[PDB]
Write a protein that binds this ligand. Structure first.
Ligand SMILES: Nc1cccc(C(=O)O)c1
Length: 338
């Protein structure tokens, strides 16, 4: 009942913000640009500093015209409406949002430890306890999101940032969506796609639990379970119903992963009658103190090295490009609600 009441309050608080979203809570010239932390086909993330408070933030900047061209309108509106309404210890917080004639802006908490992906590739693989510490945070985060009828749909090591305490902060809600029932959009990254996405079915929150299996495997092995050089070969392996496990995996880990990487979504852990509890009660999680993880009382396996809140050394280097704002409003209609 304590969990039921927690989730009921979480949903109430989410819905209040979901129904009346915040808008236009800062403007560009309140910030100094420091460094580009990441770039993509329609946007970028930059380290910025607030000129009056001195606080650092990560500012995601989306080019409205490119968002329209790449058919990402609904996805970007989803991302902002969801981020302004959620609140959970393992989600990067949205601090401000605004738009101008050219771009959409989401100003988030900066997480100087960088992406899990970088740390995983630098060390090779995580020990099972280390993988389990991160996995538990994802399980709780998905329990929270799913209780709000939210599907995340972009789990991968690049989207998990490691904070100053060694805990996970999930970022990039570009594919997150509120769904009661099914949804149909082809999205995700190839290695993490569930079979029902590849096969163009109407799919549901069970895709997140599949992706958790992929993530746990990749953390503990150092490479993802369906790896192949070409996407077509990845997809063939995903739908095949076969997975090979390193001999160093524990029997408990293999058993859990067989149940998360279950091709038949009606048999997949997280999607059975007992929901998330089939995962939380699995032997591989026997040592996990779920409340202590939520309360951030567990000592993390790894504290990222960084010098302070302005240190960018755990992110990589990109060509620094202008943030241009047109004299004329672009795509105003499409982004009215942002
Ligand atoms: N999405 C994204 C990318 C890089 C850094 C951050 C951050 O919140 O620190 C977020």
């Amino acid at each position: 009942e304590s969990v039921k009441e927690f989730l009921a309050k979480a949903k109430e608080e989410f819905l209040k913000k979901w129904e009346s979203p915040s808008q236009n809570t800062a403007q560009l010239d309140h910030f100094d640009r420091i460094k580009t932390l990441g770039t993509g086909s329609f946007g970028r993330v930059m380290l910025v500093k607030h000129k009056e408070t001195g606080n650092h933030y990560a500012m995601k900047i989306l080019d409205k015209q490119k968002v329209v061209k790449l058919k990402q309108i609904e996805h970007t509106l989803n991302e902002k409406r969801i981020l302004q309404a959620v609140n959970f210890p393992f989600l990067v917080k949205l601090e401000f949002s605004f738009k101008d004639n050219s771009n959409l802006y989401m100003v988030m908490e900066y997480v100087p430890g960088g992406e899990m992906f970088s740390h995983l590739r630098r060390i090779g693989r995580f020990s099972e306890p280390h993988a389990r510490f991160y996995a538990a945070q994802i399980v709780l985060t998905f329990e929270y999101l799913h209780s709000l009828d939210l599907i995340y749909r972009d789990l991968k090591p690049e989207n998990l940032l490691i904070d100053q305490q060694g805990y996970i902060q999930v970022t990039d809600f570009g594919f997150a969506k509120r769904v009661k029932g099914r949804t149909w959009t082809l999205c995700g990254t190839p290695e993490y796609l569930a079979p029902e996405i590849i096969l163009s079915k109407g799919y549901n929150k069970a895709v997140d639990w599949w992706a958790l299996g992929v993530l746990i495997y990749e953390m503990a092995a150092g490479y993802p379970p369906f790896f192949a050089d070409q996407p077509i070969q990845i997809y063939e392996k995903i739908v095949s119903g076969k997975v090979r496990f390193p001999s160093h995996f524990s029997s408990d880990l293999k058993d859990l992963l067989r149940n998360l990487l279950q091709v038949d979504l009606t048999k997949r852990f997280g999607n059975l009658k007992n929901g998330v509890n089939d995962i939380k009660n699995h032997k591989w999680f026997a040592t996990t103190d779920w409340i202590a993880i939520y309360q951030r009382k567990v000592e993390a396996p790894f504290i990222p090295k960084f010098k302070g809140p302005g240190d960018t050394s755990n992110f990589d280097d990109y060509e620094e490009e202008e943030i241009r704002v047109s004299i004329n409003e672009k795509c105003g209609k499409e982004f009215t609600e942002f």
